[PDB]
Design a protein around this ligand. Structure first.
Ligand SMILES: [Ca+2]
Ligand SMILES: [Ca+2]
Lengths: 264, 265
């Protein structure tokens, strides 16, 4: 039995291994620029941010979470309420002057009703959750470091993630495009799927992992720190099966790499 | 990037396949497959074909079939049952111990496949529309038959690679009692993967019957996995194309290698 993201949130809530937010960006105004030009200015306040598309000076204010799993890199997550069912996650490396954004959109009902076999017929992706990625530099930072880029370094690992004493999953990073997950313990106990995913390298042994689910529409965004054996991220989906209220909740886990598989 | 139709998969798996030779060992035999409820289906073998008679529906038919022998005493029989829409019948028969398992599988109609996964979730329906019914029994007239086949947890936790031919190679990861992941390492589906609904049964020491039912491209897979001999023998069944018309049912066989075993603390 598969479950809605709002019920997932409820299972992940208590005794979670989540990082405590930091206020370290409060008072900063960060100009995120990329190869297309200025993208979005973000000004941080306690618990919240104001964002402005650099071109139109159009944006919003949103409650936001900022966490710092590894020193010098900040994960910022907020819902963009000027758009339908959209979340925005950033990883900002202050000392290198580089950033990655993930802008995620959940599907309409009409999209979800196009079944997988028809999607096969039409050459459409199986997941209807959309994710756009940008990789840029921080305006005003002299001599920024290299842009973040895709990585193959997780492929072949099988890792267990203890999200709390009652929630535990494993991921198996199959290839550049797909990973398998299963819930070992939790409200999704015994469930498993393969889903579309994306891997980026943020720093030595630090990865940004993004997935997009095809059964229950879900966007996951997590930073995986294999040196600390810890992860920090979020899950975004509809609270229920009615395409209305959104669920966007913090997750964090202790990580254990169970094995590495090499195919001769 | 790209899923393919079963007919294309058949074409990819055809050349230099690691399949077993079909055998004519059962020609002239009538096997009376019985279960606890009574007679199930009697099968009489002739060269390349069998005749069957179904006790409960009182019906019969003739069909071409394949019979293969992976392990001594144990026979895999497969046929399309043309008397019903899009139905396949696979038997594992152990002539040493006098026991059998059957898988009767049905491919979904087009209307059924159009019910999307999220709607299935909201209604509590299975995600795969492929149906499989299992029976286990004894062979009629077989003295002192051995224990029945039954479900097994013995493959759970294994990760195995299967080389079906020089150009076709998949791995399976047996996640739990209901589900496994697969990935195509080399072949016409190269780089594709999914998780699908599966079933595991133990036929003999280190010999398993694995059945899976796919949720993206409707497909039934039935395979004997012999971990002692490091070899598999079975079939894949689906539609040739995306039009719910002609059926594909083709033999597979692979050289197996267990890559690792995963225990979760
Ligand atoms: Ca999920
Ligand atoms: Ca398949």
């Amino acid at each position: 039995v598969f479950i809605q993201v709002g019920a997932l949130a409820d299972g992940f809530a208590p005794e979670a291994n989540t990082l405590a937010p930091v206020d370290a960006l409060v008072g900063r105004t960060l100009a995120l620029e990329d190869a297309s030009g200025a993208w979005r200015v973000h000004t941080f306040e306690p618990g919240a941010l104001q964002w402005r598309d650099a071109a139109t000076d159009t944006g919003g204010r949103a409650p936001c979470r900022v966490t710092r799993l590894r020193d010098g890199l900040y994960f910022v997550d907020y819902i963009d309420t000027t758009a339908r069912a959209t979340s925005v996650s950033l990883v900002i490396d202050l000392d290198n002057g580089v950033w990655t954004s993930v802008v995620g959109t959940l599907p309409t009902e009409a999209d979800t009703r196009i079944d997988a076999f028809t999607r096969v017929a039409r050459g459409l992706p199986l997941t209807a959750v959309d994710a756009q990625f940008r990789h840029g530099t921080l305006g005003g930072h002299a001599r920024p470091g290299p842009l973040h880029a895709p990585t193959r370094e997780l492929i072949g690992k099988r890792t267990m993630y203890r999200y709390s004493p009652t929630e535990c999953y494993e991921h198996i990073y199959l290839n550049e495009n797909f990973y398998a997950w299963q819930c070992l313990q939790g409200v999704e106990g015994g469930l498993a799927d393969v889903d579309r995913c994306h891997y980026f390298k943020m720093a030595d042994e630090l990865y940004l992992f993004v997935w997009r689910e095809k059964v229950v529409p879900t966007l996951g965004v997590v930073l995986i720190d294999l040196a600390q054996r810890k992860t920090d991220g979020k899950i975004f989906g509809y609270q229920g099966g009615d395409f209305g209220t959104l669920s966007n909740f913090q997750i964090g886990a202790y990580a254990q790499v169970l094995n590495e598989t090499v195919h001769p």
